Design a protein around this ligand. Structure first.
Ligand SMILES: Cc1cc2c3c(c1C)C(C)(C)C[C@@H](O)N3c1c(nc(O)[nH]c1=O)N2C[C@H](O)[C@H](O)[C@H](O)COP(=O)(O)O
Ligand SMILES: Cc1cc2c3c(c1C)C(C)(C)C[C@@H](O)N3c1c(nc(O)[nH]c1=O)N2C[C@H](O)[C@H](O)[C@H](O)COP(=O)(O)O
Ligand SMILES: O=C(O)c1cc2ccccc2s1
Ligand SMILES: O=C(O)c1cc2ccccc2s1
Ligand SMILES: [K+]
Ligand SMILES: [K+]
Ligand SMILES: [K+]
Ligand SMILES: [K+]
Ligand SMILES: [Mn+2]
Ligand SMILES: [Mn+2]
Lengths: 500, 500
């Protein structure tokens, strides 16, 4: 089966790409696996596959770290993401995000039910497993638990059956048969949980599938619209109906090739200690004492020689930057266009710790709008910061057509030189805020409200008559024929490969 | 003579460092020299020495580009700056800035007058030169003139004789015997000009010396205090009295080894067209039509085989970033400390286009102050933004002791994650603004006022009880013995030199 449709094939693809290091000597899930993975992510090294994990028994489990992190080379920087999607490994960010958006105006392709699959090769009932006895990693030394769930997909369905959501949300082992995790507004797992809580009759049927089809984990990380079943969106994106098997103990459906499946319930009444956790912005607050949602595990099924993917998240660069930031930016681009805003491109700069999104403006269309910075900033912020797709993003930077928003250096240049602090900005205090950002949840103001800004890095004439500058750079401040001469004579005059 | 005391020896030092490319074939001062230099600056290549400049006659002149720009290697990144100062080429920014500050609590060492020097090897009177006939560069294709003056030192003295200022300010050829240039508040050349204008009796005696002692051009670029004669400050910094010769046509004194000296007057009445110019923030606004100060040239003296240094300024990285930003940051650090503010370090991040300065706070001392963000931000902004040293800087970022302000990635991380937009900031609208920043002089508000901000990236407990987080990074989220094991086994597990 293709790499984008089968996690085991994706691992093979990384190996074939010379993008994998197979560690076959014993590695401790207590910090060592995650430390190696952290070092990989900080240096853009090859993904580690831990084939000999201390505490692995009866097939549970190996670990793959850094599944969606960056490669060192510029030419295939995003190759791991491209391998989630059947794209060439040289694909640009624009191409990856366009692939992730492509299903937004296609008919869904609903999934296909099959009678079995590799995820049924092994099973453990309610008397045969103990989650405290599995080689669950301690990912950061001050974490409040062993975070089994950093790269699996939670599966929950609305009470009426009409919406099945797939999403990533963290979870850690609470005891032999329970997890605790984040279930917070406005996330779809929270929205669906609220539906079950208002109905009041039962706990939420739940499954958590690890090592799912890579195209599915991508959509799990993306804020596609309310009410949209990720399985059918992935089907449309890939052109293929995803094959799903029924859970043994409930009527949810999991990908047939899932590496590991937990089946059980998400409580509508119980909570338990959750966190702290070393999180996407680069921090952990040791001892934070929060309550989280509580999940009961009734069954585990798994592939022979199962592999658990793991995100050792924190400082740059890991899945929480490459996937959360970029996929939110993609959805924000679409949202803006659907609201008749002249946005061509969006990206969350890594330098901002993916807390900013830069929005590239088609300034010809902006000029025809005959508007002003104050008005336009307000309109953009209202659209984005009032929507779920804007949840994680605290600063929007508007830039004109000369800026490549996928290049953080150029975003930083434009922000720093074209946006006058205060005057060229609009603050939003009455919007939902993202409490995980330290200056929110551990800051001076309300953890859940405000702290957002639209920073207009459009210059005045971009609203009126057109750009009125040239850059003082090699590209723009010298004629073509001179630039070419300089390049052609560079080495010969004495000065200093694409792939490398 | 030592490299830091003699420009000709500095050129030799760059050659010996394998940091020079001697171009001995004809190069056009119309754009080509500057284009090569621009490419060097954008790629951190070796400095170009143009030994065969189309239009060079009777010794005037060769060009050295990129004299204070960056080297490619991390290990000697700042080596060209270190060679201005007799420091090892591996010197850190902290070491360079500490050297530039060292004279601030030393007695000046006044200069020594000598009867002659190399700058007297050749002369041209008022009938023998024409500035339009020299190989003055066109640096950017839309510049409003040929900018002879990008890396020389203007010399002007107060009417009472008590203060002789050395500073860099741009100037371009107006006609055969005049320049126009920037003379703007609060700069010392402007302050002294105002003194002469209030006296009303004569034009300002003036000299402009190119290819001065490197330690002198550094101080020329630094906002040392009002009334302080740069020559004596450089003397104290270097431990050596600088040797100066008298001008032929006035009673000013120039460095004895200056490559080229212009002698004349800065008018207290006349102006002429000046600019536009491709400037430090990366822009030119073609056609801008400003009036600037007008200089009359009465005499040229020069060394045999004179070399004109040139800054091809614009987008990162050139002398306008390495010298303007860093030296302003140094002075701001000292200013803060003199005002009893607990600042240990300051740097202008390149990523900010040197419009920000990050201020590292000694948070133990901050805690003892028993203050708050609002109060502390206001105090810091008042000190800095009301002072000349803060002129060019529009955003101050306060960071705690864990942040290395000389590392832009870490400044950006702290700003993006620790400063809540709006709430954690104080805007300053009633301070002098820097009109050269596009969002000022070509923006939506007053060109010369406001647009400044203090952004507090200190976390709340840094004011009270101490840092309450650990970073989610390899360094902080794993114990020492594990980190060392990972590093020691890195290659052997399959993963990937200081100088490279
Ligand atoms: C890629 C990825 C995404 C997420 C997370 C991680 C990764 C690797 C963790 C390492 C596990 C850290 C974790 O903080 N985490 C996480 C999370 N969203 C939450 O509500 N809770 C979480 O704990 N998202 C983001 C969500 O996946 C997206 O916001 C998605 O849009 C949600 O799907 P939906 O609600 O739109 O269907
Ligand atoms: C290093 C360097 C410094 C400056 C400049 C350049 C370089 C290379 C140019 C390429 C020529 C561009 C130019 O815009 N320019 C420049 C300038 N200051 C001005 O008033 N006017 C200028 O046109 N400074 C900055 C000043 O040199 C410092 O602000 C210094 O502090 C002044 O000295 P003082 O008034 O404190 O004595
Ligand atoms: O653990 C963390 O990094 C995260 C928790 C959340 C919650 C919601 C959205 C993104 C993330 S990222
Ligand atoms: O030409 C430009 O880059 C500059 C003009 C000025 C004026 C004052 C201070 C710095 C600079 S930098
Ligand atoms: K999703
Ligand atoms: K603007
Ligand atoms: K100076
Ligand atoms: K703060
Ligand atoms: Mn969803
Ligand atoms: Mn001065």
């Amino acid at each position: 089966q293709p790499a984008h449709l089968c996690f085991r094939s994706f691992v093979e693809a990384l190996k074939v790409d010379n993008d994998l290091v197979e560690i076959n000597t014993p590695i401790d899930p207590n910090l060592e696996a995650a430390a190696i993975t952290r070092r990989v992510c900080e240096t853009n090294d090859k993904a580690p596959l831990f084939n000999n994990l201390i505490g692995m028994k009866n097939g549970l489990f190996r670990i793959l770290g850094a599944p969606g992190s960056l490669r060192k080379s510029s030419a295939d920087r995003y190759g791991r993401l491209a391998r989630h999607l059947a794209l060439p490994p040289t694909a640009s960010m624009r191409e990856i995000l366009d692939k992730m958006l492509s299903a937004s105006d296609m008919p869904p392709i609903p999934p296909t039910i099959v009678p079995t699959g590799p995820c049924k090769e092994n099973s453990l009932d309610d008397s045969e497993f103990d989650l405290t006895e599995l080689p669950v990693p301690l990912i950061h030394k001050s974490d409040g638990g062993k975070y089994i769930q950093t790269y699996g997909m939670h599966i929950v369905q609305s009470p009426d059956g009409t919406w099945t959501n797939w999403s990533i949300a963290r979870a850690m082992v609470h005891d032999k048969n329970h997890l605790t995790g984040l279930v917070i507004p406005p996330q779809h797992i929270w929205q669906i949980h609220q539906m079950w809580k208002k109905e009041g009759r039962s706990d939420v049927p739940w499954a958590l599938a690890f090592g799912v089809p890579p195209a599915a984990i991508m959509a799990s990380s993306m804020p596609i619209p309310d009410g949209v079943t990720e399985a059918g969106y992935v089907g449309a994106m890939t052109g293929s109906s995803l094959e799903l098997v029924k859970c043994d103990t409930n009527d949810l459906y999991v990908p047939a090739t899932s590496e590991i499946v937990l089946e059980g319930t998400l409580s509508i009444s119980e909570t338990g200690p959750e966190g702290p956790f070393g999180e996407m912005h680069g921090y952990i607050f040791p001892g934070d004492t929060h309550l989280g949602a509580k999940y009961k595990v009734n069954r585990i099924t798994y592939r022979n020689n199962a592999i658990m993917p793991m995100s050792s998240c924190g400082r740059l660069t890991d899945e929480t930057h490459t996937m959360i930031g970029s996929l939110a930016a993609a959805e924000i681009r679409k949202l803006c266009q659907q609201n008749d805003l002249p946005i061509t491109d969006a990206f969350a700069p890594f330098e901002s710790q993916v807390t900013w999104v830069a929005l590239r403006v088609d300034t010809e269309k902006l000029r025809a709008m005959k508007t002003t910075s104050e008005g336009f900033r307000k309109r953009v912020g209202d659209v984005v910061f009032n929507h779920k797709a804007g949840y994680t993003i605290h600063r929007l930077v508007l830039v004109g057509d000369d800026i490549d928003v996928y290049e953080g250096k150029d975003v930083l240049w434009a922000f720093s030189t074209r946006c006058r602090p205060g005057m060229d900005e609009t603050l939003f205090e009455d919007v939902r805020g993202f409490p995980l950002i330290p200056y929110m949840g551990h800051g001076n103001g309300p953890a859940h409200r405000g702290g957002k800004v639209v920073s207009d890095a459009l210059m005045p004439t971009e609203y009126t008559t057109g750009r009125n500058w040239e850059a003082a750079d090699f590209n723009q401040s010298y004629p073509e024929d001179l630039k070419q001469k300089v390049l052609d004579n560079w080495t010969k005059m004495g000065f200093s490969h694409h792939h490398h």
